[PDB]
């Protein structure tokens, strides 16, 4: 069943509303799991689709040096390559 989940925020960009959107969404199977910096609601039958949402972040620090913001974990099947997938915050 759907187990892997990892997404963090940009460096000092601290989250305020992500708690709200964590609490909000609940679709046919639910755990309300949350690890105090993350969000964990994935469990379901075999699912191959994706969905959409919107989340932004609160500002703790003025500056951002040019070093991109990709938080990538990747583990989906033993045989194929485990399939990294990246794109930077072009604000840099």
Ligand X SMILES: *[C@@H]1O[C@H](CO)[C@@H](O)[C@H](O)[C@H]1NC(C)=O
Residues near ligand X (CB under 6 A)? 46-48
- Rounded to a whole number of angstroms, the minimum distance from the CB of residue 90 to ligand X is 33
**Shortest Å distance, C-beta 23 to ligand X:** 26
Instruction: Give me the least distance between CB of 75 and ligand X, in Å please.
Output: 17
Rounded Cα distance between 8 and 38, Å, is 7
Residues in CB range of 12: below 8 A, 6 or more apart: 59, 60, 61
CB of 6 to ligand X, least distance (A): 22
For ligand X, which is the closer residue by CB, 49 or 52? 49
Identify which of residues 45 and 67 has a Cβ nearer to ligand X in the complex.
Answer: 45
> Do residues 60 and 34 touch, judged by C-beta distance below 8 A?
no
Distance CA 4, CA 65 (A): 30
52, two tokens: 């959409």
């Amino acid at each position: 069943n759907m187990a892997i989940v990892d997404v963090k925020m940009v460096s000092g960009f601290i989250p305020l509303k992500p708690t709200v959107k964590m609490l909000e969404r609940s679709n046919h199977v639910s755990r309300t799991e949350v690890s105090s910096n993350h969000v964990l609601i994935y469990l379901d039958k075999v699912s191959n689709q994706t969905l959409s949402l919107f989340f932004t972040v609160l500002q703790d620090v003025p500056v951002r040096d040019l070093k991109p913001a990709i938080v990538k974990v990747y583990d989906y099947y033993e045989t194929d390559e485990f399939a990294i997938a990246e794109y930077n915050a072009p604000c840099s």
